[PDB]
Amino acid sequence: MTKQIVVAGALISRGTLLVAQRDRPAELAGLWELPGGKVTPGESDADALARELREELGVDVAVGERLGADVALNDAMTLRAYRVTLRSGSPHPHDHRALRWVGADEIDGLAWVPADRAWVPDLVAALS
Ligand SMILES: Cc1c[n+]([C@H]2C[C@H](O)[C@@H](COP(=O)(O)OP(=O)(O)OP(=O)(O)O)O2)c(=O)[nH]c1N
């Protein structure tokens, strides 16, 4: 068996990180994540992530290098983050409850969705 991929983006602008507050499902609603979503059939990781961020945030990004380690979300799925940079737009929460730009001092204490917490040191490092 092979695992489905979920891609997430670490958008850093002016030394701060975009985080996004989920509105669904109930178990994650109110918690914060790196925005992204499931890769659909035929898509590269970059294609999927750029599409998700265009849909969720209304921005065009360039997809860069991996950020941190892959995370086993559950027995079916693997979550991967990439550094992304803003080419065009201001993020807007189409799907999320809220967005926030956070600096290094606000990464550890943020109410992360459980899976994304694994990336805290990587995110702090990328910001420092
Ligand atoms: C983007 C993302 C997603 N995560 C989890 C939440 C879900 O259990 C699964 C899929 O993410 P989701 O954002 O729901 O993907 P969608 O593509 O929007 O899901 P569909 O409703 O299936 O389209 O990954 C997660 O833990 N962290 C994170 N940064």
What is the distance in A from the centroid of ligand 1 to the CA of 110?
18
Contact 35, 18 (CB under 8 A): yes
CA nearest ligand 1 atom 12, residue: 37
112 phi and psi, to 5 degrees?
-70, 150
What is the distance in A from the centroid of ligand 1 to the CA of 118?
16
Write down the experimental method used for this entry. Answer: X-ray
CA 27: distance to chain centroid? 17
Rounded to whole angstroms, the Cα distance separating 111 from 117 reads 9
41 phi and psi, to 5 degrees?
-55, 135
Domains in the chain: ranges and CATH: 1-128 (3.90.79.10)
67 phi and psi, to 5 degrees?
-120, 115
- Residues flanking ligand 1, CB < 6 Å: 6, 8, 33-34, 36-38, 73, 79, 113, 115-116
Output the CA torsion 8→109→21→85 (10° steps). -40
What is the distance in A from the centroid of ligand 1 to the CA of 6?
7
Strands (E) located in the chain = 4-13, 16-21, 32-33, 36-38, 60-72, 77-88, 98-102
